[PDB]
Design a protein around this ligand. Structure first.
Ligand SMILES: COc1ccc(Nc2cc(C(=O)O)ccc2NC(=O)c2cccc(CC3CCCCC3)n2)cc1
Ligand SMILES: COc1ccc(Nc2cc(C(=O)O)ccc2NC(=O)c2cccc(CC3CCCCC3)n2)cc1
Length: 191
């Protein structure tokens, strides 16, 4: 299993409009998120690859850490990172950690899916957030996602996240029993 970490765009995934990007201040009252949310690809519910391990308001935005736990996803991505010329083409030559480099460049955006802001003000009936997605398109804010084998290393890549903020994030990550999370539903698109 891998960890992912990054700042999210906050998005409502509207049916009619093409996209709505929320100001983070519109949702910070519902933070932190300390229960697992599905992590999917490009907001597709049949592409669960793992589970969030916390969403926290820090000084420079809303930071998410997550676990990529899907066996079919990790095995496929790991095989492509070692053998696929296409996957490696946008990456620097001969990376020490090809799987981490490939995810970093192909899935650089984290997006947090929220209810519409009209609901956000206020007293929503049920959960404010539906999922976090790894995205290839549609990034607005700065910073990109970091993938790694150890959460502390992932979070400490972000120079804009302070030592106190990182310790707070890492406390929540450590309190999560990875074994207890159900298997995400990702299926290998080759099957
Ligand atoms: C782990 O490997 C994969 C391979 C393909 C998919 N999805 C997919 C599906 C189907 C299908 O259904 O027909 C067709 C195309 C697919 N994927 C893309 O066009 C694409 C574009 C940008 C980023 C990614 C994420 C992936 C890229 C490779 C490194 C691991 C991360 N995928 C998802 C995961
Ligand atoms: C839906 O069916 C498929 C077919 C092939 C793959 N991927 C794959 C496989 C194998 C294999 O097996 O050895 C080797 C390389 C593969 N693909 C990638 O490394 C890669 C990386 C980034 C994005 C994509 C999307 C890809 C899908 C549509 C054509 C254009 C670009 N693919 C993924 C899904």
């Amino acid at each position: 299993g891998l960890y992912v970490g990054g700042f999210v765009d906050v998005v409502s995934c509207p049916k009619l409009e093409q996209e709505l990007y929320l100001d983070p201040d519109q949702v910070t009252d519902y933070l932190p998120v300390t229960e697992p949310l599905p992590i999917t690809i490009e907001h597709l519910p049949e592409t669960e690859v793992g589970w969030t391990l916390g969403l926290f308001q820090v000084s420079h935005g809303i930071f998410c850490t997550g676990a990529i736990t899907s066996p079919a996803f990790l095995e496929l991505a790991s095989r492509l990172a070692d053998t696929s010329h296409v996957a490696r083409a946008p990456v620097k030559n001969l990376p020490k950690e090809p799987l981490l480099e490939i995810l970093h460049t192909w899935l650089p955006g984290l997006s947090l899916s929220s209810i519409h802001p009209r609901e956000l003000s206020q007293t929503p009936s049920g959960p404010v957030f539906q999922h976090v997605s790894l995205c290839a398109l549609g990034r607005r804010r700065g910073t990109v996602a970091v993938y790694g084998h150890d959460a502390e290393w992932v979070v400490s890549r972000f120079s804009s996240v302070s030592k106190s903020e990182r310790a707070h994030i890492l406390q929540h990550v450590s309190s999560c029993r990875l074994e207890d999370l159900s298997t995400p539903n990702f299926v290998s698109p080759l099957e």
